[PDB]
From Swiss-Prot:
Keyword Hydrolase among record annotations: yes
Name of the protein in question: Exo-beta-1,3-glucanase
Organism of this sequence: Streptomyces sp. (strain SirexAA-E / ActE)
Similarity-based family: Belongs to the glycosyl hydrolase 55 family.
Effect of residue 117 to A: 1300-fold decrease in catalytic efficiency
Length: 548
């Protein structure tokens, strides 16, 4: 109706005194570990304090977070663990979960976080090691760490790629295909391809994700200020910049609340808190009020009915969308997420809009279709961790059954993407038409299910680039960026390149690679006509170190 009130039956809130925390977190996990396409959603929230005897195992659609003004305010003598036991060592489907704002003192000196995509690890203090591979040496496809600090060494082991920003680590064990770092103290030296480390001193701009906390015995949302030249944690010394907003200024969205009503809230001047669950909407969610926070908990999910655009953000400063999944419905939406309206040359440099831990799925948990997933019109927008994913397995998958032509389409100027994961689109996964774009870390996989060469011919080109820049663009820069193929339906296919871009002095790429998995199809080149083809069946990347 208003601000505040309860968080709903999916927001489980603990203090040190709570009867059997362990057996409880294991209760949620037993429900959620193999629950890949289920509709249950959980947020586990912990008041400031010290928690003994806890191995908090995190399954699908589970978020865990501390409630302290600082991470060290909520301390586990114990672990927040992701492993792969349900896929027999294979961490490759460990999606859609999250940990934030906790200190961990892990049980054997290491904490195990063996995740793949859409599994953010933010604002975490690990007083030990961090192993990013499940128990195994099994295959893994992560991942994202921000504003964290790992007193010890990070161990990616069998992880294919990884992005870390604005953190400190006590060590970094290895790189496989693409480990990228920006603003990370203790990050290994720039060395791609050998090892494949892409290392930037600082992050051009970042703004830490808002989060729910107890300002004493009062719930508020902390809303971090941005930094230029971010390096290291925002909190280390942490009395940093930002505003604390009472929960009583948030529409606490649940039940099967509606779209008229959610949009009524923003207009009446409220922020949005999506408690964990699944929201239809037969109409779009609309945020055209400057500095509106729309914060999800427990992988809160929006499904658009009727072919509408789930979320539309108008031409305003400061909007902070965080921690939402948008799951396409049966009717093809032209767009799923629009950031800014169309032809809008207004600049937003002081107080840009951001999408953080915004995930998109097309198919998998049933039929879904969308023409474009995310369109970014707003100049100066920050895209800080997104996974935009056309499903390659689960219910409702198929070259027409869940066709999604376009992943992300950036038309705004001065847009920054940090931790960009986009996979399986029928045409261009990513297209960049705006000026002066920057991407730090890209991971792509091409659609597995294109039937034949003729189905993916792109004028004079075989296949659509995983990342296209329009030939008129004069400035662009990308760092640490890979495209992989697995043409299973037709391993005779050729993909002409991962990347396409005009040859111009202001259009620069660093540390590119393409990869064929098991000789299933091949790349002709890396970028335009530069870089070798892939060949053999051995899964050996082909890399370009700088371009043009």
């Amino acid at each position: 109706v208003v601000g505040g009130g309860d968080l709903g039956p999916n927001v489980l809130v603990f203090d040190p005194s709570t009867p059997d925390i362990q057996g409880k977190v294991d209760e949620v996990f037993r429900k959620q570990e193999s629950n890949q396409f289920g509709t249950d959603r959980y947020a586990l929230m912990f008041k400031p304090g010290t928690y003994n005897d806890i191995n908090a195992q995190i399954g699908f659609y589970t978020s865990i977070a501390g409630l302290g003004l600082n991470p060290d305010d909520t301390t586990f003598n114990g672990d927040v663990t992701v492993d792969a036991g349900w896929f027999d060592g294979n961490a490759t489907q460990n999606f859609w979960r999250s940990a934030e704002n906790l200190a961990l003192n892990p049980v054997n000196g290491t904490n195990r976080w063996a995740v793949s995509q859409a599994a953010p690890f933010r604002r975490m203090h690990v007083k030990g090691g961090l192993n990013l591979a499940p128990d195994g040496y099994g295959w893994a496809s992560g991942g994202y760490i921000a504003d964290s600090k790992i007193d010890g060494e990070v161990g990616p082991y069998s992880q294919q790629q990884w992005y870390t920003r604005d953190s400190s680590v006590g060590g970094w064990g290895n790189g496989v295909w693409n480990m990228t770092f920006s603003g990370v103290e203790g990050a290994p030296a720039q060395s791609f391809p050998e090892p494949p480390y892409t290392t930037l001193e600082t992050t051009p701009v970042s703004r830490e994700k808002p989060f729910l906390y107890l300002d004493g015995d009062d719930y508020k949302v902390f809303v971090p200020a941005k930094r230029t030249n971010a390096r290291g944690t925002s909190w280390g010394n942490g009395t940093p910049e930002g505003e604390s907003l009472p929960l009583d200024q948030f529409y606490v969205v649940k039940p099967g609340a509606t779209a008229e009503t959610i949009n009524a809230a923003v207009d009446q001047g409220l922020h949005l808190l999506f408690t964990p669950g699944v929201y239809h909407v037969d109409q779009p969610i609309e945020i055209d009020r400057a500095n509106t926070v729309a914060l999800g908990l427990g992988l809160a999910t929006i499904i658009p009915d009727n072919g509408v655009t789930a979320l539309k953000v108008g031409d305003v400063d400061g909007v902070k969308v965080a921690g939402l999944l948008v799951d396409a419905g049966p009717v093809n939406s032209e767009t799923l997420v629009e950031v800014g309206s169309d032809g809008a040359s207004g600049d937003h440099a002081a107080n840009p809009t951001s999408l953080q831990d915004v995930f998109v799925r097309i198919g998998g948990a049933g039929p879904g279709k969308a023409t474009t997933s995310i369109v970014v019109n707003s100049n100066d927008t920050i895209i800080d961790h997104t996974w935009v994913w056309r499903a390659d397995h689960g219910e409702g998958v198929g070259w027409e059954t869940n066709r999604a032509d376009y992943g992300v389409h950036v038309k705004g100027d001065n847009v920054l993407a940090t931790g960009l994961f986009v996979e399986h689109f029928n045409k261009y996964d990513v297209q960049w038409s705006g000026e002066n774009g920057k991407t730090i870390f890209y991971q792509n996989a091409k659609a597995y299910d294109a039937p034949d060469q003729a189905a993916i011919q792109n004028g004079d080109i075989k296949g659509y680039a995983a990342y296209k820049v329009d030939d008129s663009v004069t400035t662009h820069e990308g760092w640490g960026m890979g495209s992989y193929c697995y043409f299973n339906v037709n391993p005779d296919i050729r993909q002409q390149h991962g990347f396409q871009a005009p040859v111009k002095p202001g259009v620069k790429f660093h540390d590119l690679l393409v990869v064929s998995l098991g000789g299933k199809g091949q790349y002709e080149h890396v970028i335009n006509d530069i870089g070798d083809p892939t060949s053999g069946d051995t899964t050996i990347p082909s890399q370009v170190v700088s371009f043009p």
